[PDB]
Symmetry: D3
Subunit: 132 residues, 6 copies
Amino acid sequence: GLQRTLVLIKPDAFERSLVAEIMGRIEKKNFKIVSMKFWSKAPRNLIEQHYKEHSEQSYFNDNCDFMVSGPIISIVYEGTDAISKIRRLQGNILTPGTIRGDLANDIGENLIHASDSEDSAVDEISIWFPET
Amino acid sequence: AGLQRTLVLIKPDAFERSLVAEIMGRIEKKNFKIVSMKFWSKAPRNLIEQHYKEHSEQSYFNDNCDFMVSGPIISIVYEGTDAISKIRRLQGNILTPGTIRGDLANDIGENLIHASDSEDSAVDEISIWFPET
Amino acid sequence: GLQRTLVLIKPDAFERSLVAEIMGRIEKKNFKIVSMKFWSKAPRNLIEQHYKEHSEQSYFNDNCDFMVSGPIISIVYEGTDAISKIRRLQGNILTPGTIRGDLANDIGENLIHASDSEDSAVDEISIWFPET
Amino acid sequence: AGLQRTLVLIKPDAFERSLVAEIMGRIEKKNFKIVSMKFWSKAPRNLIEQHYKEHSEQSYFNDNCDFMVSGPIISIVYEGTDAISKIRRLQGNILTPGTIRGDLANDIGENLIHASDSEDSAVDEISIWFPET
Amino acid sequence: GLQRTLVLIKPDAFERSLVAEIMGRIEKKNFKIVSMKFWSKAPRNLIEQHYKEHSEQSYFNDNCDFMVSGPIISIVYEGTDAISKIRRLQGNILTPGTIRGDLANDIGENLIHASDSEDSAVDEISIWFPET
Amino acid sequence: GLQRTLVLIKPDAFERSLVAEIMGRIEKKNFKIVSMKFWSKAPRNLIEQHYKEHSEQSYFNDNCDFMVSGPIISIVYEGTDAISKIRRLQGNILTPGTIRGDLANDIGENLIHASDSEDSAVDEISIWFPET
Ligand SMILES: Cc1cn([C@H]2C[C@H](O)[C@@H](COP(=O)(O)OP(=O)(O)O)O2)c(=O)[nH]c1=O
Ligand SMILES: Cc1cn([C@H]2C[C@H](O)[C@@H](COP(=O)(O)OP(=O)(O)O)O2)c(=O)[nH]c1=O
Ligand SMILES: Cc1cn([C@H]2C[C@H](O)[C@@H](COP(=O)(O)OP(=O)(O)O)O2)c(=O)[nH]c1=O
Ligand SMILES: Cc1cn([C@H]2C[C@H](O)[C@@H](COP(=O)(O)OP(=O)(O)O)O2)c(=O)[nH]c1=O
Ligand SMILES: Cc1cn([C@H]2C[C@H](O)[C@@H](COP(=O)(O)OP(=O)(O)O)O2)c(=O)[nH]c1=O
Ligand SMILES: Cc1cn([C@H]2C[C@H](O)[C@@H](COP(=O)(O)OP(=O)(O)O)O2)c(=O)[nH]c1=O
Ligand SMILES: [Mg+2]
Ligand SMILES: [Mg+2]
Ligand SMILES: [Mg+2]
Ligand SMILES: [Mg+2]
Ligand SMILES: [Mg+2]
Ligand SMILES: [Mg+2]
């Protein structure tokens, strides 16, 4: 049955004009935009919240700084097994066929974020879309 | 210099046929930047009727509004050199291959996309869709 | 309202692996396959009939020979204004954006045929699809 | 040498979503040749039930046949080095990006495409769809 | 008849990762690569030569600076009607379907140069590949 | 860290018009072209060198003949983790998502060579671009 998951199109996707490329990959796998906001600049604490479970990490600040270094889009996708399948679609820069595997080559600038659990999903959605 | 802003509507037939990223991608490939964007799961029939005010006396006016509310739409303010005209050309018409409608659309009504056609209608449409100015 | 038109994917489309490329262009413009046959080799008189209005032309024989020099696909597409709009989609090798304009560069090997009138349409369909 | 032939079905969800050329194109890009092709506007429920005989005792068997008759299908015999296995991998599954199903499908039932999985089921399926042998 | 033409993939193509995209359009139109040269920065002399006609124009200096502001690729293409077809393929920033039509939006940063005439083709080929 | 790697676009890429397609995949993964050479026919010496490890293998002669049976392009790519990422991008004819995975189907005619190691990368770059 349906799930929703949260996707962030990161600022590097704007710098490299891969926004539509990334969104189309999730679009062609038959997922739907239930919700979506463009942020010319995401307010920092939104980003910090979104990555709060990373607050103790070596990279936490640099990543938030990067995540704030350009536009981003937050999308709520709905579809069967959305969370897992979009996560897979995201992939990683070592796995060709996925978004990062095909278009990304950095440990921070990797184009996209996607929720990895029902709970991070539910959580991340409330962050970028509080009004529900 | 020539930096304009124009209003694009991704129409509901775009979503129905999963052509949304395809349409935006053509605009993205031509080097235009999203300045603002709003996803509407269903647009208020009010905003549609405003957007299309100049057509209020046309035979197609209500069928079209019906359609513009049949599904999601995305309103996008695009910015870049000579944006209005260039994006208007990118929209094209169902008769000219090479354009969005030319390649992708085949109806007088369900034509995937709207683009402002003048500095005047742009400023105004940007107004209708993003009241925050 | 609907029209049907007849499309031939020519043998050069098989040699150059542009079959799906061509069919997708007509597919993305929202036309439907109502009918379709693959011919590993089209019988010559089918080809000759199809081009019968060209029988007096300088190129008539060479073209039939070429049209017989590989597989072809005959498709009946249905859609609003099918005949005219697919014709346009076909285009010519001087008009970028069209099939020939983007992928073809010869006066004979031009990838695709599409009916240019309601009558040639009706006719060409009966040829490649007699069983109706 | 390794020249095999395999049977591909473009399923009806492919037509519904206008992904037919996309699917065939992936097979075309990998250098496989169409040996035969049949457009069915609606497949005889008989041929579907034969094609899926090995599944006759499965919970999904009838839902699936219902679906395989819900729209057009195209049956294609593809030929090329190591075709069965290679095209089977090209089909993949809805879990593996990079493949047809991986990139394009998201259902246990509506998965765009069928490919033979063995020399045995190939010869047989080629038989079911092209009796002319 | 069969001609050869000179294409320059300009540095914005590299900036925007459009090199393959550009070459791909010419490739798919069935034009062959006859020779080619990667230039991480083109000798300013060469650009000045290449754009000699333009030495009196306002945009001349600006253009040279840009033509040298990043890598370029110089390609010699061969094929039927190559000069004018590849010119058409190049197009302009107003009309979609073309390289510039689809991908460019500047009067100066326009991705690709293609010779526009029999003479200029000879001239330009000699500049970039003086070995013929 | 940042490496350089040697890619060869093999003659079947040219036969099948896949050059841009291949380069495009590497381009979109964000790898830069550091230098490049078009070869209408590669000197057989060069191929023999390039495939030196393989001098004892059954397929060695067959391969040399093919590697010389049409044009090739030799490219030096630079980028983070370039050798192994571009190797992954090259892939194999079994697993889709890769260049070979999506576009190739022969044990010998497989479109692209990419260096597989730090050493072979140095070696191969020296063969094709001995000027460094
Ligand atoms: C591990 C890591 C992550 N990041 C950034 C990019 C990651 O997408 C994000 C969270 O890291 P992580 O959860 O490891 O990646 P993923 O998004 O695949 O779950 O933080 C860095 O900037 N540097 C790093 O070293
Ligand atoms: C002319 C026409 C327009 N429409 C709708 C679709 C158009 O996008 C919208 C405005 O019409 P118009 O200004 O003619 O189209 P464009 O979007 O090219 O400016 O009205 C119809 O539904 N039926 C019609 O006959
Ligand atoms: C004019 C011409 C056509 N042909 C072939 C290719 C054409 O598609 C077909 C019919 O010619 P024509 O009707 O002129 O082209 P179209 O298909 O655009 O109507 O015959 C040649 O082989 N040589 C020629 O000189
Ligand atoms: C397992 C399964 C299959 N099917 C349908 C879709 C499959 O293409 C077909 C055969 O099943 P299966 O052999 O599992 O799939 P594949 O096509 O990968 O061999 O049956 C369902 O409708 N529901 C199901 O739960
Ligand atoms: C007209 C013009 C050209 N240019 C640059 C871009 C052009 O590709 C180049 C030569 O001009 P031109 O020959 O007009 O361009 P093309 O014939 O390639 O369309 O100089 C400018 O930078 N500014 C200008 O105003
Ligand atoms: C194994 C093998 C390789 N080759 C060719 C294709 C290979 O790209 C090349 C070198 O073999 P190999 O190093 O196995 O290929 P790669 O490491 O690039 O996958 O020789 C054959 O022609 N026949 C064969 O049986
Ligand atoms: Mg994580
Ligand atoms: Mg208007
Ligand atoms: Mg004609
Ligand atoms: Mg099975
Ligand atoms: Mg000029
Ligand atoms: Mg090796």
